[PDB]
């Protein structure tokens, strides 16, 4: 069976995996619950043969999968991009750690509490974390070298995320923007932005205090 990816009608944790399919030119199929189909999969949860009910899930010829951490790993390696050493798949995961803590970080409470009040305390601790990737990247085109990679894709989602959060988040580290554009530079992913599959927003769940609603 050909690759089947299911996810919420949001970019979400699923942007890096959908985006990684296209840099890799991997072809995929999509089943997405719309405005109220999320509840319907109740009956479908234990009848899917899936080990642990949730989204995303992944039915192919070879395996039954779910969750963002796991799916990114499984797809990339078959296509030779999960990592090459004890040191660097770790480095990958660490860089994953860096984007996720900041991204799962915006999402602690972006659809919860007063996001603006909690914005200020987190936008108080972010400069170091943002400044770390900009200093490491001066000699390399991206974080790890010369061919675009998946840490960059959650990172792509990432850069979008503090900038929609805070427009002038990025006033003092200019390198990241040209760099996002260089990962965005690959022809195929551009065309899918061009194509019908591209969904600009919301990044998080539909009902979000911040980043929520059908229309910006």
């Amino acid at each position: 069976m050909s690759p089947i990816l299911g996810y919420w009608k949001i970019k979400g944790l699923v942007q890096p995996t959908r985006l990684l399919l296209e840099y890799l030119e991997e072809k995929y199929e999509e089943h997405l619950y719309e405005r109220d189909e999320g509840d319907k999969w109740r009956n479908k949860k234990f009848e899917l043969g899936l080990e642990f009910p949730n989204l995303p899930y992944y039915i192919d010829g070879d395996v039954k999968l779910t969750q963002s951490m796991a799916i990114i790993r499984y797809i990339a390696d078959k296509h030779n991009m999960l990592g090459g050493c004890p040191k660097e798949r770790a480095e990958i995961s660490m860089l994953e750690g860096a984007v996720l803590d900041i991204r799962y970080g915006v999402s602690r409470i972006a659809y919860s509490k007063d996001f603006e009040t909690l914005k200020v305390d987190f936008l108080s601790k972010l400069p170091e974390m943002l400044k770390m990737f900009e200093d490491r990247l001066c000699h390399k085109t991206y974080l790890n070298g010369d061919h675009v990679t998946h840490p960059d894709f959650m990172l792509y989602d990432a850069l979008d995320v503090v900038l929609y959060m805070d427009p002038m988040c990025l006033d003092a580290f200019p390198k990241l923007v040209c760099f996002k554009k260089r990962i965005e530079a690959i022809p195929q992913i551009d065309k899918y932005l061009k194509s019908s599959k591209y969904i600009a927003w919301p990044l998080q769940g539909w009902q979000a205090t911040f980043g929520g609603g059908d229309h910006p």
Partner: protein, 569 residues
């Protein structure tokens, strides 16, 4: 003061007296273009009863590389002409290239005077086969919105623009042409893309009376109606409410429309029902306007692949080919409006320039000795050489034409040129490989709004400290300004050559400036280039322009959708 048959009379008598009139005009340029030390050290001194034959062997031919240094003088800091005549009001970039570099030709007053006269001959001959209403207006895609000041403090400008912004534009064209849909202010408007849809809207507002639809070539109309096909629902929603959309940011265009904006629910209903009913958007031009006579533009040479799609848009209506002319000079005119575009051919104007022709025939190519235009043999192909008042003396464009026939004693021509390309080595390189990857790289962010890039260019600015960047971009539709800023940064890191990229990184060359020119700009310079007096096949676009290039230069500073210096560094 235009008389329809009297202007054709001047042309008709002229075609009959072509030989005498031409040697006189040869004498004219010789009497006029003289005292530049270039002409005299080439040997010229004036007059005699010996002005033609001795001249051709004695006085030397020119190419773009040799022509490059002397206006280079004029454009840079100090206006210092030595090969043309007067210090030029504006300079013109010529098509093809100079060893991979920008081409140089001066633009004079006579052309604007020649513009009025050639066109005057054109539409009058057209009017005998296509009678017109004198009180009507026309739908024309003509833009003169961009002007720049040279490093030398001199204006540089495309042929077309220089004419439109000239003090004599209105008096010279009041009697002889049907009014533009768009106000002149809108033809001069900072946003030609926005001017493009509003002038188009302007057309629909007076659809019953319009007699023309105009651009210089076919594919520009083509892209326009794709846009119309793309944004027509956008047009009618604006009309129902009577409010112009928020996509539109430019100061002059929104105020024009606000005055022209009255709630019209009904028009939007009429247009919407009619527009959706048609199949596969083939030929919408007469439908939108019930009384228009024709579609006008260039339809030969490189335009042949674009002829079916203009035909696609044209349908069963007669196709009229625009006269063949340029910033170098005006060379030919269509005096047979009834004939189709494929068999169409353009009449040489006797008094505008001395044309001699470099022989192609015996093998490939040829160095056979040249002959006069009327002295040229029927049915054979030769590459034109031009001596005129644009400071061009024996200038080889590099392009070959065939003789279809004769309006009396003056030849009509067909141009099978679709590429004249020959090249050498460029030192603003930065090759196309790298530029194409770079422009394409920065392209995706705009593409998030389903908009794609039409065209690209770059510039060498020695007015500024330091010499630097300057990028041109044409896209299908309007977009916000912040995505563009970031695009500038990709372009900033995209060019990868050691010298350039090291300087770029530490701003030894200034931080990249991104200015978004409006749509059809490059299309308009393409308009100029195919018409280049020679063999109608001359459109290959220089991708980075020296202080030395020219069409592109006028364009860069004012007509900015937005202008931003690097959001990097």
């Amino acid at each position: 003061t235009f008389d329809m048959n009297r202007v054709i009379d001047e042309f008709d008598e002229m075609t009959r007296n072509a030989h005498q009139v031409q040697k006189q005009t040869l004498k004219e340029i010789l009497l006029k273009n003289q005292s530049a030390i270039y002409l005299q050290n080439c040997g010229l001194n004036g007059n005699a009863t010996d002005p033609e034959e001795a001249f051709k062997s004695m006085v030397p031919l020119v190419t773009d590389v040799e022509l490059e240094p002397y206006i280079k003088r004029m454009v840079d800091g100090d206006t210092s002409p030595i090969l043309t005549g007067h210090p030029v009001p504006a300079i013109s970039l010529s098509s093809g290239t100079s060893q991979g570099r920008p081409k140089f030709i001066p633009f004079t007053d006579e052309l604007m005077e020649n513009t009025l006269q050639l066109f005057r001959t054109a539409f009058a001959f057209r009017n005998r086969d296509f009678p017109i209403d004198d009180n009507g207006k026309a739908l024309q895609f003509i833009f003169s919105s961009k002007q720049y000041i040279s490093t030398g403090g001199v204006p540089v400008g495309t042929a077309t623009t220089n004419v439109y912004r000239n003090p004599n534009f209105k008096a010279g064209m009041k009697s002889i042409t049907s009014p533009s849909c768009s106000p002149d202010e809108v033809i001069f408007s900072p946003d030609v893309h926005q001017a493009l849809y509003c002038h188009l809207l302007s057309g629909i507002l007076f659809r019953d009376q319009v007699q023309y639809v105009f651009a210089v070539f076919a594919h520009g109309l083509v892209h326009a109606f794709r846009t119309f096909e793309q944004v027509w629902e956008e047009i009618v929603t604006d009309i129902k409410d009577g409010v112009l959309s928020n996509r539109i940011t430019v100061p002059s265009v929104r105020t024009a429309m606000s005055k022209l904006l009255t709630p019209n629910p009904e028009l939007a209903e009429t247009i919407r029902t009619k527009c959706m009913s048609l199949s596969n958007w083939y030929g919408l031009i007469p439908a939108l306007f019930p009384n228009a006579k024709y579609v006008y533009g260039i339809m030969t040479g490189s335009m042949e692949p674009y002829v079916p799609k203009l035909r696609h848009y044209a349908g069963d209506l007669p196709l009229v080919s625009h006269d063949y002319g340029s910033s170098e000079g005006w060379i030919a005119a269509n005096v047979t409006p009834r004939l189709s575009p494929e068999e169409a051919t353009f009449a040489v104007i006797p008094n505008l320039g001395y044309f001699e022709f470099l022989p192609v025939s015996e093998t490939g190519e040829g160095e056979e000795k040249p002959v006069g235009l009327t002295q040229v043999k029927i049915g054979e192909e030769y590459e034109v050489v031009i001596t005129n008042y644009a400071g061009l003396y024996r200038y080889r464009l590099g392009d070959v034409v065939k003789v279809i026939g004769f309006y009396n004693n003056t030849p009509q021509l067909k141009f099978i040129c679709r590429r004249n390309l020959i090249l050498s080595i460029n030192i603003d390189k930065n090759t196309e490989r790298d530029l194409q990857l770079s422009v394409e790289s920065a392209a995706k962010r705009l593409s998030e709004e389903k908009i794609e890039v039409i065209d690209f260019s770059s510039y060498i600015d020695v007015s500024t400290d330091p010499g630097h960047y300057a990028i041109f971009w044409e896209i299908s539709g309007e977009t916000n300004e912040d995505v563009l800023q970031d695009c500038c940064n990709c372009l900033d890191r995209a060019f990868i050559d050691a010298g350039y990229v090291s300087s770029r990184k530490c701003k030894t060359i200034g931080a990249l400036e991104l200015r978004v020119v409006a749509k059809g700009t490059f299309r308009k310079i393409q308009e100029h280039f195919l018409g280049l007096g020679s063999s109608a096949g001359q459109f290959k676009m220089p991708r980075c322009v020296k202080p030395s290039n020219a069409k592109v230069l006028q364009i860069l500073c004012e007509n900015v959708v937005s202008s931003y210096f690097s959001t990097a560094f």
